[PDB]
Nucleic acid binder design. Structure first.
Ligand SMILES: O=c1ccn([C@H]2C[C@H](O)[C@@H](COP(=O)(O)NP(=O)(O)OP(=O)(O)O)O2)c(=O)[nH]1
Ligand SMILES: [Mg+2]
Ligand code: NA
Ligand code: NA
Ligand code: NA
Ligand code: NA
Ligand code: NA
Length: 325
DNA sequence: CGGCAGTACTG
DNA sequence: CAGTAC
DNA sequence: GCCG
């Protein structure tokens, strides 16, 4: 990370634009900051900047000011509202729109939110676990959680394949939450298991709150909730579970393993090749309009393994650790 | 000019 | 649907 | 914000 002074100044602006809802500008900063982080040498020329992909004149100028002026004047013109929008949007379930609305309504603190804001069920849970959801757990605990889910799953069907994905699979030392993918090699015994699984996990008091769980739908694909391991010193942890048909195992695994940036890059590439990649499948011959919107369903390509996805995209396979973008 | 990933819940 | 999220 |  030879462009540190540059990044921590840009990360400030990135977050500022993000919480304010200027999503694409924030994306631009995100990519540039990214490029900066994974680069070999400090940059010295505003020609040495434009060169780095993800950095144009606009961005270059700002790094220059960060090197020469040793500071970015833009940072001093950030709305005083940003810290509060950040505070608000860090409540699970509240995004930029809700944060801006609360701010516009005069709310400035979580105390204000707690006592006067109309919260959705999800936001109330997010607020209740505000600090907890901002904390990462040692990967070891993520193991205990994956194991807890797997145990409950395999309880009514030992054939069920359960695997922790996300940051865990990419080998990170700490995890923001636990992402568990569940499927079954017989390609059918995965149907309508959420009902049973979630119920057992609730019986033992493991699950404490549900955020997203359309259980009245037998086609439910994901469960997003909160759990807590037994014993003292335990914090509530975010738990995500997806149940996919074996036929989509590779794409689901690839998707759920991420990283998010990596997935988007993969999908953007697939798109340039007339293909479409999703958590369900990799498709080819996908018809699209001038707006890049899928007009034609295309054809689903066989992808029994992640390697296959990379291969079909003409990419060298990458271990999960090599996808931590 | 205009896309920037593709998808799944919630209310 | 807009919002939020993975 | 960047880039095709
Ligand atoms: O915008 C997103 C978010 C997530 N994902 C995929 C990739 C990601 O690794 C996976 C799980 O999402 P998390 O939000 O749980 N992120 P991750 O587990 O990588 O990191 P963290 O340790 O913060 O949870 O879902 C996307 O494709 N797009
Ligand atoms: Mg995760
Ligand atoms: Na470049
Ligand atoms: Na939020
Ligand atoms: Na969030
Ligand atoms: Na997650
Ligand atoms: Na529900």
């Amino acid at each position: 990370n030879h462009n540190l002074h540059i990044t921590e100044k840009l990360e400030v602006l990135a977050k500022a634009y993000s919480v304010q809802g200027d999503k694409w500008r924030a994306l631009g900063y995100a990519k540039a900051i990214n490029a900066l982080k994974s680069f070999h040498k400090p940059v010295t020329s505003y020609q040495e900047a434009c060169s780095i992909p993800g950095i144009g004149k606009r961005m270059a100028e700002k790094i220059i000011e960060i090197l020469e002026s040793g500071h970015l004047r833009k940072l001093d013109h950030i709305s005083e509202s940003v810290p509060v929008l950040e505070l608000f949007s860090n409540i699970w379930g509240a995004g930029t729109k809700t944060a801006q609305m609360w701010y516009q309504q005069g709310f400035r603190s979580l105390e204000d939110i707690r006592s006067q804001a109309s919260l959705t069920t999800q936001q109330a849970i997010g607020l209740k676990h505000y600090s907890d959801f901002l904390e990462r757990m040692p990967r070891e605990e993520a193991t205990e959680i994956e194991q807890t889910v797997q145990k409950a799953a395999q309880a009514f069907n030992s054939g069920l394949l359960c695997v922790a994905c996300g940051s865990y699979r990419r080998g990170k030392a700490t995890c923001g939450d636990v992402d568990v993918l569940i499927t079954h090699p017989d390609g059918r015994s995965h149907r309508g298991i959420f009902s049973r699984l979630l119920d057992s996990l609730r019986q033992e008091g493991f699950l404490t709150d549900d955020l997203v769980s359309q259980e009245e739908n037998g086609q439910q694909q994901k469960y997003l909730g909160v759990c807590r391991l037994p014993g003292p010193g335990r914090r509530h942890r975010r738990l995500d579970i997806i149940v996919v048909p074996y036929s989509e195992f590779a794409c689901a695994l690839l998707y759920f393993t991420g990283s998010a940036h990596f997935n988007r890059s993969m999908r953007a590439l697939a798109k340039t090749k007339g293909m479409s990649l999703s958590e369900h499948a990799l498709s080819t011959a996908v018809v699209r309009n001038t707006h890049g919107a899928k007009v034609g369903p295309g054809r689903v390509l066989p992808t029994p393994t992640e390697k296959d996805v990379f291969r079909l995209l003409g990419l060298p396979y990458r271990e999960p650790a090599e996808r931590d973008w």
